[PDB]
Amino acid sequence: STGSATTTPIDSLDDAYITPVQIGTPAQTLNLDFDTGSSDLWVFSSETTASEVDGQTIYTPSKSTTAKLLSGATWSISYGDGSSSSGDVYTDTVSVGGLTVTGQAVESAKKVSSSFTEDSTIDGLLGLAFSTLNTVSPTQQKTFFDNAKASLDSPVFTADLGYHAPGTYNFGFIDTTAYTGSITYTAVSTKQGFWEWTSTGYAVGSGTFKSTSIDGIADTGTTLLYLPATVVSAYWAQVSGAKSSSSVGGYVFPCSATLPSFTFGVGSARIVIPGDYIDFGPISTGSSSCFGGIQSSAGIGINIFGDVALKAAFVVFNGATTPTLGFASK
Ligand X SMILES: Cn1cccc1CNCCc1c[nH]c2ccccc12
**Shortest approach of ligand X to residue 58 CB, angstroms?**
16
User: CA nearest 271: which of 238, 309, 326?
Assistant: 309
Q: How many CB atoms lie within 10 A of CB 39?
A: 28
**Shortest approach of ligand X to residue 271 CB, angstroms?**
22
**Shortest approach of ligand X to residue 182 CB, angstroms?**
32
Taking the least distance from each CB to ligand X, the nearer of 79 and 163 is 79
Q: What angle do CA 272, 277, 280 make, to 5 degrees?
A: 150
**Shortest approach of ligand X to residue 115 CB, angstroms?**
4
Cβ neighbours of residue 202 closer than 8 Å, sequence gap 6 or more: 209, 210, 212, 214, 227, 231, 262, 263, 264, 265
Tell me which residues touch ligand X (CB under 6 A).
15-16, 33, 79, 81, 83, 115-116, 119, 122, 221, 223, 248-249, 283, 291
Q: Which of 35, 92, 279, 307 is catalytic?
A: 35
Taking the least distance from each CB to ligand X, the nearer of 81 and 153 is 81
307 has catalytic annotation: no
Q: Which of 199, 261, 296, 297 is catalytic?
A: 199
**Shortest approach of ligand X to residue 265 CB, angstroms?**
26
Q: What one-character-per-residue DSSP string does 17-61 give?
A: EEEEEEETTTTEEEEEEEETT---EEE-BTTS-GGG-SS---B-G
User: Is the previous residue joined to 9 through a cis bond, with omega within 30 degrees of 0?
Assistant: no
35 has catalytic annotation: yes
Taking the least distance from each CB to ligand X, the nearer of 272 and 283 is 283
Q: Classify residue 163 by burial, with Cβ atoms within 10 Å: 0-12, 13-18, 19+.
A: middle
Taking the least distance from each CB to ligand X, the nearer of 58 and 283 is 283
Q: How many CB atoms lie within 10 A of CB 286?
A: 5
Taking the least distance from each CB to ligand X, the nearer of 179 and 305 is 305
Task: Using alpha carbons, list the distances in angstroms from residue 304 to 227, 297, 307.
Answer: 7, 7, 9
Would you give the distance in Å from CA 259 to the centre of its chain?
Answer: 24
**258 residue type, one letter:** T
- Catalytic residue numbers read 35, 199
